[PDB]
Amino acid sequence: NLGTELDYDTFCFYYDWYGSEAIDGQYRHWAHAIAPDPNGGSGQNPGTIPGTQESIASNFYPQLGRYSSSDPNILTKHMDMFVMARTGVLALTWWNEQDETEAKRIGLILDAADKKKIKVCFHLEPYPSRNVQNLRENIVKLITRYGNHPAFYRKDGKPLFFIYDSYLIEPSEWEKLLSPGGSITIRNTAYDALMIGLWTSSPTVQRPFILNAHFDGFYTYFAATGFTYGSTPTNWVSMQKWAKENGKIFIPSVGPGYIDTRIRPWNGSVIRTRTDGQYYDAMYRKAIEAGVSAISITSFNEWHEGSQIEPAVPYTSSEFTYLDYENREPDYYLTRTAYWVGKFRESK
Numbered sequence: 001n002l003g004t005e006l007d008y009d010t011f012c013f014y015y016d017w018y019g020s021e022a023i024d025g026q027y028r029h030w031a032h033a034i035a036p037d038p039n040g041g042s043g044q045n046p047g048t049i050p051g052t053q054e055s056i057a058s059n060f061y062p063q064l065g066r067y068s069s070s071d072p073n074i075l076t077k078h079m080d081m082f083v084m085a086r087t088g089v090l091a092l093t094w095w096n097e098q099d100e101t102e103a104k105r106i107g108l109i110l111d112a113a114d115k116k117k118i119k120v121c122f123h124l125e126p127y128p129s130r131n132v133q134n135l136r137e138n139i140v141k142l143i144t145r146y147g148n149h150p151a152f153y154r155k156d157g158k159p160l161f162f163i164y165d166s167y168l169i170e171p172s173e174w175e176k177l178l179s180p181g182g183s184i185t186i187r188n189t190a191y192d193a194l195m196i197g198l199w200t201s202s203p204t205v206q207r208p209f210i211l212n213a214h215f216d217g218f219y220t221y222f223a224a225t226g227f228t229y230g231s232t233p234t235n236w237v238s239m240q241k242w243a244k245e246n247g248k249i250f251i252p253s254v255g256p257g258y259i260d261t262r263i264r265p266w267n268g269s270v271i272r273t274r275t276d277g278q279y280y281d282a283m284y285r286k287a288i289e290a291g292v293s294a295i296s297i298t299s300f301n302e303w304h305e306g307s308q309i310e311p312a313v314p315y316t317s318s319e320f321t322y323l324d325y326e327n328r329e330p331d332y333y334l335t336r337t338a339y340w341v342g343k344f345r346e347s348k
């Protein structure tokens, strides 16, 4: 009873797409295309970020440098950072890449997590031609391949998946997978799981979707307050009330800030400034105050979107002057997370 234990109802969104030239053949994701402006006309030549030491695809700079997500020693350090933050579940981005380098990374992550008693669940992304049939096939593959790993997450005996952009699939399709009567149901099978869909817009649209698709719960993802109805924290009390009334699990997503203008220069309206951690505090406070049973954190290391709690350091190159953690130390967002985990556990 030290107040330092991992919390297993706290989920931190984790990305394993970073590479080094040495380990992966390229500085993967540190190099990144610059997205054209959706409202910016037809002849755009936006360019790319080369992913050199001076110029990486983030408005911030990692304390660990241009790391490889395949590097066992980087993984060990990340797991130690999870321990520091008291975040007991790593929610791994999963893009269905069906290649051996990804299979290797997933094994390394599970192994490194287990050494620190961290758990892993999968964040199922909108991969090409994703539909309920191949989703089932991939759920089967993941549970079969990893269900016996000691680090594989379970809640009251069930695996848990977050489904990004779930709303892109019709409720009549979801019901085949998620209804107890569905033609390809996972309910009452070896592959049953808590399915947590992405709540985006207004209750008028989202309430029937969640009910008719038979999702077990919902999350909101976006670190930038106000980006969607779901990511507007003043809605969370109301959202929790509905969740409780309808037997659903609400897992609001909290983040320390947002900025993606290195890769999306036209997207400045979505910037949310960290102000020495006050933004993080405000958002985490709203989640706890809503009376939820679980909280998700956006993100551990989505460096592109500037939502990361992973330690960042001050850096000025000839190419760019990076943002940093201002008056706070590089590990401030890890220790502040630990602080909020404590408060969460206090009132659970």
Ligand SMILES: OC[C@H]1O[C@H](O[C@H]2[C@@H](O)[C@H](O)[C@@H](CO)O[C@@H]2O)[C@@H](O)[C@@H](O)[C@@H]1O
Binding pocket: 165, 200, 222, 227, 228, 267, 270, 305
């Ligand atoms: O405009 C860039 C925007 O893209 C991403 O969000 C998109 C999508 O995933 C979401 O489902 C909807 C919800 O309204 O919005 C976009 O279409 C995110 O990367 C976001 O942070 C970013 O601003």
Ligand SMILES: OC[C@H]1NC[C@@H](O)[C@@H](O[C@H]2O[C@H](CO)[C@@H](O)[C@H](O)[C@H]2O)[C@@H]1O
Binding pocket: 032, 093, 123, 125, 126, 164, 302, 304, 305
């Ligand atoms: O994990 C859910 C959701 N979060 C924000 C992004 O990480 C998004 O993925 C895409 O955008 C990133 C850059 O922010 C890009 O590098 C990646 O290729 C896209 O998939 C993700 O689905």
